[PDB]
Design a protein around this motif. Sequence first.
Motif, PDB file in Angstrom:
ATOM      1  N   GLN A 145     -15.023  59.827   3.105  1.00 27.62           N
ATOM      2  CA  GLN A 145     -14.036  60.913   3.027  1.00 27.62           C
ATOM      3  C   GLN A 145     -12.919  60.472   2.099  1.00 27.62           C
ATOM      4  O   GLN A 145     -12.769  59.299   1.804  1.00 27.62           O
ATOM      5  N   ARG A 146     -12.085  61.411   1.705  1.00 26.72           N
ATOM      6  CA  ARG A 146     -10.983  61.112   0.804  1.00 26.72           C
ATOM      7  C   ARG A 146      -9.836  62.026   1.172  1.00 26.72           C
ATOM      8  O   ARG A 146     -10.029  63.244   1.322  1.00 26.72           O
ATOM      9  N   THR A 206     -14.912  65.623   2.844  1.00 20.70           N
ATOM     10  CA  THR A 206     -15.838  64.765   3.598  1.00 20.70           C
ATOM     11  C   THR A 206     -17.272  65.078   3.171  1.00 20.70           C
ATOM     12  O   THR A 206     -17.649  66.252   3.088  1.00 20.70           O
ATOM     13  N   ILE A 207     -18.054  64.039   2.895  1.00 19.70           N
ATOM     14  CA  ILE A 207     -19.512  64.154   2.854  1.00 19.70           C
ATOM     15  C   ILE A 207     -20.055  63.616   4.173  1.00 19.70           C
ATOM     16  O   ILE A 207     -19.697  62.501   4.594  1.00 19.70           O
ATOM     17  N   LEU A 216     -16.248  62.933  -5.722  1.00 21.87           N
ATOM     18  CA  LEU A 216     -16.657  62.024  -4.658  1.00 21.87           C
ATOM     19  C   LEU A 216     -18.171  62.047  -4.513  1.00 21.87           C
ATOM     20  O   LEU A 216     -18.819  60.991  -4.407  1.00 21.87           O
ATOM     21  N   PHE A 217     -18.755  63.242  -4.576  1.00 24.01           N
ATOM     22  CA  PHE A 217     -20.213  63.326  -4.457  1.00 24.01           C
ATOM     23  C   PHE A 217     -20.908  62.620  -5.628  1.00 24.01           C
ATOM     24  O   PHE A 217     -21.881  61.879  -5.430  1.00 24.01           O
ATOM     25  N   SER A 267     -12.803  69.530   4.215  1.00 24.25           N
ATOM     26  CA  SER A 267     -11.760  69.110   5.120  1.00 24.25           C
ATOM     27  C   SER A 267     -11.893  67.591   5.354  1.00 24.25           C
ATOM     28  O   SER A 267     -12.893  66.937   4.998  1.00 24.25           O
ATOM     29  N   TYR A 268     -10.878  67.069   6.012  1.00 22.23           N
ATOM     30  CA  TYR A 268     -10.853  65.660   6.430  1.00 22.23           C
ATOM     31  C   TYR A 268     -11.352  65.670   7.878  1.00 22.23           C
ATOM     32  O   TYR A 268     -10.572  65.741   8.828  1.00 22.23           O
TER      33      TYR A 268
END
Length: 189
Positions: A111-112, A95-96, A136-137, A71-72
């Motif tokens: 986040q993206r 989100t990380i 992203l990770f 999620s964002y």
Amino acid sequence: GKILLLGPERKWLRDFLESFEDEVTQYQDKLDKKSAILNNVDFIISYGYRYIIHPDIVERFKQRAINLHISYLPWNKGADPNLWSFLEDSPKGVTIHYIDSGLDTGEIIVQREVTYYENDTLRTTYERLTQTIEKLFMEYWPLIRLGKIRGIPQPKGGSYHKLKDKEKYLYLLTDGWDTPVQKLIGKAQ
């Protein structure tokens, strides 16, 4: 370096984590706070872990435990974020963040935002979130693992849901995963 991966086994992710010459252990069951699985563990990554991490572990691994959440944040903490982002018409994304005491409320590392399209279903938006967070990770782990970056505090607010909250909306999901999302937007207000 020793990485503990919490959640299901993922071959791409093992080979990625192991190419840093880190040794990687994986566990998907409930983790006793005194378990020797944690001995000598330098970093915990959770991704699709189905259990709450015991608070004493969380505390013991402050700034050494991250979670991959689709999620964002702060919107859609907790369960079924993809469905709730359409039911509550919220920001969509991944989100990380560092792992906290409490449910998905630790600091945001990156986040993206993830877009959706008029023909999308729950299935195609979920797979898009999954591809996004995994890319992203891979972009940010080299920095995370060398303590090169750190988090900003996660804003209070957003939303949070439990697995059971969706029960009263299941009737809308006439095709399960293949339900078009357009039908679902705003149905929880």
